[PDB]
Design an enzyme around this catalytic site. Structure first.
Site, short mmCIF file in Angstrom:
data_model
loop_
_atom_site.label_atom_id
_atom_site.label_comp_id
_atom_site.label_asym_id
_atom_site.label_seq_id
_atom_site.Cartn_x
_atom_site.Cartn_y
_atom_site.Cartn_z
N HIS A 237 -26.49 20.89 -19.47
CA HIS A 237 -25.98 21.48 -20.71
C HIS A 237 -25.40 22.87 -20.50
CE1 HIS A 237 -26.31 18.70 -23.88
NE2 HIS A 237 -27.61 18.72 -24.04
N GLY B 186 -36.70 17.30 -28.49
CA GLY B 186 -37.25 17.00 -27.18
C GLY B 186 -37.19 18.25 -26.32
N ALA B 187 -36.06 18.95 -26.42
CA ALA B 187 -35.87 20.26 -25.79
C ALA B 187 -34.56 20.87 -26.30
CB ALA B 187 -35.86 20.13 -24.28
N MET B 188 -34.32 22.15 -26.02
CA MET B 188 -33.07 22.80 -26.42
C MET B 188 -32.47 23.66 -25.32
SD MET B 188 -30.65 23.10 -28.57
CE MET B 188 -29.22 24.18 -28.68
N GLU B 189 -31.17 23.52 -25.12
CA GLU B 189 -30.51 24.06 -23.95
C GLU B 189 -30.06 25.52 -24.09
OE1 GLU B 189 -26.93 22.05 -26.13
OE2 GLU B 189 -29.09 21.66 -25.90
N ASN B 190 -30.72 26.27 -24.98
CA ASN B 190 -30.40 27.69 -25.17
C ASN B 190 -30.04 28.38 -23.86
OD1 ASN B 190 -31.47 27.32 -27.88
ND2 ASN B 190 -33.50 27.58 -26.95
N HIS C 225 -31.19 16.83 -17.87
CA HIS C 225 -30.38 16.87 -19.09
C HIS C 225 -30.07 18.30 -19.53
CE1 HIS C 225 -28.79 14.94 -22.76
NE2 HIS C 225 -29.28 15.98 -23.41
N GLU C 226 -31.09 19.14 -19.61
CA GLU C 226 -30.91 20.48 -20.15
C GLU C 226 -30.10 21.38 -19.22
OE1 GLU C 226 -32.60 19.05 -23.36
OE2 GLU C 226 -31.75 21.07 -23.27
N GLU D 231 -29.81 24.80 -33.24
CA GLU D 231 -28.84 23.72 -33.36
C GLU D 231 -29.19 22.75 -34.48
OE1 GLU D 231 -28.35 21.22 -30.00
OE2 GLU D 231 -26.29 20.64 -30.51
C1 LIG Z 1 -32.31 14.08 -24.98
C2 LIG Z 1 -33.66 14.74 -24.71
C3 LIG Z 1 -33.74 15.23 -23.26
C4 LIG Z 1 -33.83 15.90 -25.71
C5 LIG Z 1 -32.55 16.23 -26.55
C6 LIG Z 1 -32.29 17.77 -26.45
P1 LIG Z 1 -30.73 18.10 -26.47
O1 LIG Z 1 -30.38 18.80 -25.24
O2 LIG Z 1 -29.94 16.87 -26.59
C7 LIG Z 1 -30.39 19.14 -27.86
N1 LIG Z 1 -29.25 19.73 -27.80
C8 LIG Z 1 -30.54 18.42 -29.00
C9 LIG Z 1 -31.43 19.19 -29.96
C10 LIG Z 1 -31.16 18.69 -31.37
C11 LIG Z 1 -31.60 17.41 -31.67
C12 LIG Z 1 -31.40 16.81 -32.92
C13 LIG Z 1 -30.72 17.55 -33.91
C14 LIG Z 1 -30.29 18.80 -33.60
C15 LIG Z 1 -30.49 19.41 -32.35
C16 LIG Z 1 -32.73 15.72 -27.97
O3 LIG Z 1 -31.80 15.76 -28.77
N2 LIG Z 1 -34.04 15.45 -28.48
C17 LIG Z 1 -34.99 14.44 -28.92
C18 LIG Z 1 -34.62 13.91 -30.31
C19 LIG Z 1 -33.21 13.39 -30.38
C20 LIG Z 1 -32.11 14.06 -30.83
N3 LIG Z 1 -31.00 13.26 -30.73
C21 LIG Z 1 -31.36 12.05 -30.19
C22 LIG Z 1 -30.58 10.92 -29.90
C23 LIG Z 1 -31.22 9.84 -29.37
C24 LIG Z 1 -32.60 9.85 -29.12
C25 LIG Z 1 -33.38 10.97 -29.41
C26 LIG Z 1 -32.75 12.10 -29.96
C27 LIG Z 1 -35.08 13.27 -27.94
N4 LIG Z 1 -36.26 12.48 -27.86
O4 LIG Z 1 -34.09 12.92 -27.29
ZN LIG Z 2 -28.50 17.11 -24.97
#
Ligand SMILES: CC(C)C[C@H](CP(=O)(O)[C@@H](N)CCc1ccccc1)C(=O)N[C@@H](Cc1c[nH]c2ccccc12)C(N)=O
Ligand SMILES: [Zn+2]
Ligand SMILES: *[C@@H]1O[C@H](CO)[C@@H](O[C@@H]2O[C@H](CO)[C@@H](O)[C@H](O)[C@H]2NC(C)=O)[C@H](O)[C@H]1NC(C)=O
Ligand SMILES: *[C@@H]1O[C@H](CO)[C@@H](O[C@@H]2O[C@H](CO)[C@@H](O)[C@H](O)[C@H]2NC(C)=O)[C@H](O)[C@H]1NC(C)=O
Ligand SMILES: *[C@@H]1O[C@H](CO)[C@@H](O)[C@H](O)[C@H]1NC(C)=O
Ligand SMILES: *[C@@H]1O[C@H](CO)[C@@H](O)[C@H](O)[C@H]1NC(C)=O
Ligand SMILES: *[C@@H]1O[C@H](CO)[C@@H](O)[C@H](O)[C@H]1NC(C)=O
EC number: 3.4.11.-
Length: 869
Positions: free
Chosen positions: A318, A278-282, A314-315, A144
């Protein structure tokens, strides 16, 4: 325009042609972990809409080496394609000799190859340390939003959903994982094996995942018979216990709540050592940072538990929101992210009420409001083009604000009718995409009278910022004024659902508002009123006249007569209006008096948080006279609550949070007792050599205090490489950064760049950590500024890392000079650097700071001196 080698590119838009349509991918990947590269091929079952002579899809850093098209009917098997690359758009053109026929299926197929990614994206390489000290490698995918194209050539947009059949060749030492369960493994000639994974359901490309590793797992089954597994480094399987426990409880919840079964037969959660996000919802194969997933009771605190629970929630949210129902395009990323962020609340309140996340939720909305009160903000739903701009879509607007307006909507509609909306939405778009509009239609359509709700939320999603609801009370008349809340406009107007209470009845009066101003009556010339109950609405409210004084007074007397969330709101808004100019700082400071009475940790921690902020602003300048009286006002006032704090792990979650909070404050403020106990506990821990145990809730406080001696700092650092709890490592690193010696800090940073001891994924946070401290704010600015080029090798602009490295080192600046330097650095960036939205936000933020100082600084000085009297 076109390239690479002369010729042309039949297509010019960075958006893909809608003519060719993918239905299925036969994907074969053959990675080598000693060779550190891969070799792979694919076969895409296309469907031609209109007739064409060329096929356009995405590819990046993939050496393509054999393009053919086959004929299920046209021709035989088969014919060869001419491959045309155009990097500046991350596209490739496949050129057909014989024009294609509308309504007929085809099979594009090619062989490609590359080295495993060198940092956190596409199909990359990660390593980890074992208990014995052995360094080991795995290959993992993270796609992503637009990195799938770096792994396999493909129609790389969320609309282009297809089935995927994945095969992986591997050694005996490794396992191979992917979205779907493994159907079979077959022994090959030279001793190799080949995992065959069940074909996927329809799904967007950014969710395709595969991993070859030698990890270990714990498995269990949910009620609906899904096999959940927690994968992690072999020596870390003990930490996967909670994750599994929570995984099942949550998946269950989600199935019941959404009334839709998880489609697949298994769901894996795997802890990745080197993981940027932080994580990815694959779908079926969700990846996590070790700190997002692994829990260790000897070393992971209460808030830690709450963290990994949250991110797990969260994941899983998703799999429905995002995976099953995907947005059409990255402009509406909020439909995926805002909802997941929201379900964290619902799902965790439901399955884990004892974690008391409900009281922590307002922080989500507060955090974003800080940025939504700046001009440079943006609407939840906004256009996005280049990958970088798509990346930029991931922020506290898409996430927090998105989640916060739904919480508003739900309140307006009641749990059930709101729930019904979401059951229907997810069902209606299963295995397909959706658009911002599509959603609101389903949330309002749960005689013959109608929910125009759409009108309402449509404005909430399409215009930037947050409304300021002014309120004047002349007896029994209430003027209702709406404005665009700003940190000291023209055209903005929301349909903002009002709530309130009177001093008489605690009964909740609702209401709406769609005009620039209205007015309401009062069935009792009452003491005070309190708009926005429990702060369930995304707006700030300012009381004109004696409203602010009466409400404050009320808290000074029977403070319990106002909802606890009402309190937290009053506290939050009072200070926000100071920064808005609508109030004078001493009125805010005069509210923080009743905090001697306050027992609701949320409200007490909110109030305190502001006083703690001021100290650190003062302390960042050399403003000693204020910062010191501020210190001595926190130690004297609140001495009761501070002195009640056990250096233990006992009580509720809010008990444990309050303790860590208070105890940190004390040790920050150099409270003799505090820092002597932490120094003691620490010295014991070291002189006993890990054998003694610090309660987790004070683990960080202890390490940070022990960090002040060089003997301790060196021990902590050496113990950083040896720990098997990344949560501990997290706390050790924070402690390592509370140091005062520039070289010690500098070392941490340099080690971060290197990424061997301190993993690259931690650089952004580390840099940020150091900057906050007076002794380290300059050093960091220097560093970011000087080494910016080397920083852009490691990270994307704007990856969260870069975006965060920037603001982490500048946003806290509060002097004219610094604004100049930063203004000037953002200038430098005007090349491959410029441009990022973060540039504005930061500047607007540094100015908001200077003005707060001028408009309010001396006031702080005397309110405090008035107290020392
Ligand atoms: C929300 C948390 C449980 C993890 C979350 C995973 P996802 O489930 O939201 C996933 N789909 C996003 C992965 C991604 C992140 C950034 C760019 C491309 C792809 C996250 O985004 N990660 C980091 C970094 C981050 C990305 N956007 C943000 C918006 C606000 C704050 C932090 C972030 C985090 N620490 O949340
Ligand atoms: Zn998310
Ligand atoms: C990746 O490459 C390594 C060599 O770098 C392969 O290992 C060798 O494979 C051949 C053929 O089976 C054997 O004769 C050697 O004994 C192997 N050496 C070692 C140390 O493994 C390995 O098989 C490749 N891995 C995959 C899955 O392709
Ligand atoms: C591609 O994925 C879709 C799901 O999006 C699969 O469709 C299901 O197929 C099964 C087996 O034939 C049916 O029983 C279900 O009714 C289908 N589900 C839905 C909701 O459509 C489809 O099988 C996959 N295609 C391939 C080639 O396997
Ligand atoms: C393909 O055909 C449809 C049906 O007339 C038409 O609307 C569309 O513009 C065509 N697509 C293109 C631009 O090739
Ligand atoms: C949390 O769960 C309880 C039931 O345990 C429910 O009554 C309550 O409404 C939920 N809280 C919120 C604000 O969602
Ligand atoms: C505050 O109000 C509560 C609720 O009526 C009451 O129980 C208590 O006696 C009051 N306390 C004070 C300080 O008057």
């Amino acid at each position: 325009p076109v390239a690479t080698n002369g010729e042309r590119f039949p297509w010019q838009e960075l958006r893909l042609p809608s003519v060719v349509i993918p239905l299925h991918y036969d994907l074969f990947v053959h990675p080598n972990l000693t060779s550190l590269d891969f070799v792979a091929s694919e076969k895409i079952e296309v469907l031609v809409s209109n007739a064409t002579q060329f096929i356009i899809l995405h590819s990046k850093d993939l050496e393509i080496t054999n393009a053919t098209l086959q004929s299920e009917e046209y021709m035989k098997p088969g014919k060869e394609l001419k491959v045309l690359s155009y990097p500046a758009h991350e596209q490739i053109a496949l050129l057909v000799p014989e024009k294609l026929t509308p309504h007929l299926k085809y099979y594009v197929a090619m062989d490609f190859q590359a080295k495993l990614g060198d940092g956190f994206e596409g199909f990359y390489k990660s390593t980890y340390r074992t208990l014995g000290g052995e360094t080991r490698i795995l290959a993992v995918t993270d796609f992503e939003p637009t990195q799938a194209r770096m792994a396999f050539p493909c129609f790389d947009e969320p609309l282009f959903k297809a089935n995927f059949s994945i095969k992986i060749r591997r050694e005996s030492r490794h396992i191979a994982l992917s979205n779907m369960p493994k159907v079979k493994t077959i022994e090959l000639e030279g001793g190799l094996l080949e995992d065959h994974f069940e074909t996927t359901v329809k799904m967007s490309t950014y969710l395709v995942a595969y991993i070859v590793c030698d990890f270990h797992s714990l498995s269990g089954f949910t009620s609906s018979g899904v096999k959940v597994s927690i994968y992690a480094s072999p020596d870390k399987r003990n930490q996967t216990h909670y994750a599994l426990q929570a995984s099942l409880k949550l998946l269950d919840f989600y199935e019941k709540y959404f009334d839709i079964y998880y489609p697949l037969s298994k769901l894996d959660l795997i802890a990745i050592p080197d993981f940027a996000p932080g994580a990815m919802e694959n779908w079926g194969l969700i990846t996590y940072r070790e700190t997002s997933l692994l829990f260790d009771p000897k070393t992971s605190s209460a808030s830690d538990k709450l963290w990994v629970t949250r991110v797990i929630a969260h994941e899983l949210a998703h799999q429905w929101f995002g995976n099953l129902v995907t947005m059409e395009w990255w402009n509406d990323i909020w439909l995926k992210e805002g909802f997941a962020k929201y379900m964290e609340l619902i799902a965790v309140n439901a399955t884990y009420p004892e974690l008391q996340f409900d009281d922590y939720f307002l922080n989500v909305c507060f955090e974003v409001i800080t940025k939504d009160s700046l001009n440079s903000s943006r609407p939840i739903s906004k256009p996005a083009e280049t990958p970088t701009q798509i990346q930029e879509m991931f922020d506290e607007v898409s996430y927090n604000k998105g989640a916060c307006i739904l919480n508003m909507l739900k309140d307006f509609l009641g749990e059930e009718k709101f729930q019904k909306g979401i059951i229907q939405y997810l069902k209606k778009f299963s295995y397909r995409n959706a658009k911002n509009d599509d959603l609101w239609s389903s949330l309002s359509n749960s005689l013959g009278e109608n929910a125009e709700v759409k009108e309402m939320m449509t404005t909430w999603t399409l215009q930037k910022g947050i409304p300021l609801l002014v309120v004047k009370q002349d007896g029994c008349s209430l003027r209702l004024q709406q404005e665009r809340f700003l940190q000291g406009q023209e055209r903005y107007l929301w349909h903002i659902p009002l709530t309130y209470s009177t001093s008489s009845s605690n009964v909740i009066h609702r209401h709406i508002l769609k005009s620039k101003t209205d007015t309401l009556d009062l069935p009792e010339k009452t003491s005070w009123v309190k708009f926005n109950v429990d702060s369930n609405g995304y707006y700030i409210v300012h009381y004109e006249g004696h409203g602010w004084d009466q409400l404050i007074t009320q808290l000074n007397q029977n403070h319990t007569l106002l909802r606890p969330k009402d309190r937290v709101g009053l506290i939050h808004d009072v200070f926000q209006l100071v920064g808005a100019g609508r109030l004078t700082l001493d009125k805010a400071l005069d509210m923080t008096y009743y905090l001697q009475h306050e027992t609701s940790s949320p409200a007490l921690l909110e109030g305190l948080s502001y006083l703690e902020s001021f100290y650190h602003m003062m302390d960042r300048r050399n403003i000693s006279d204020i910062s010191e009286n501020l210190k001595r006002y926190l130690l004297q006032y609140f001495k009761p609550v501070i002195d009640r704090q056990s250096w233990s792990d006992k009580g509720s979650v809010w008990d444990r949070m309050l303790r860590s909070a208070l105890l940190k404050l004390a040790c920050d403020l150099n409270h003799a007792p505090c820092i002597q106990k932490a120094a003691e506990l620490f010295s014991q821990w070291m002189e006993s050599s890990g054998k003694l145990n610090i309660p987790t809730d004070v683990l960080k406080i202890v390490y940070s205090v022990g960090a002040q001696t060089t003997a301790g700092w060196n021990y902590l650092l050496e113990q950083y490489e040896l720990s098997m709890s990344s949560a501990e490592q997290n706390k050790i690193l924070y402690a390592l950064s509370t140091s005062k010696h520039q070289e010690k800090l500098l070392k941490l940073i340099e080690l971060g760049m290197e990424g061997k001891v301190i993993k690259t994924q931690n650089l952004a946070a580390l840099l940020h950590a150091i900057a906050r401290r007076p002794k380290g704010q300059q050093l960091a600015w220097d560093f970011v500024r000087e080494n910016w080029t080397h920083l852009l090798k490691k990270f994307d602009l704007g990856s969260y890392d870069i975006r965060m490295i920037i603001s982490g080192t500048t946003a806290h600046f509060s002097s004219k000079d610094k604004l100049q330097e930063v203004k000037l650095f953002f200038e430098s960036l005007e090349a491959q650097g410029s441009h990022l939205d973060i540039f504005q936000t930061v500047l607007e933020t540094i100015t908001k700071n200077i003005k707060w100082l001028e408009k309010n600084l001396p006031t702080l000085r005397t309110w405090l001196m008035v107290n020392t009297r």
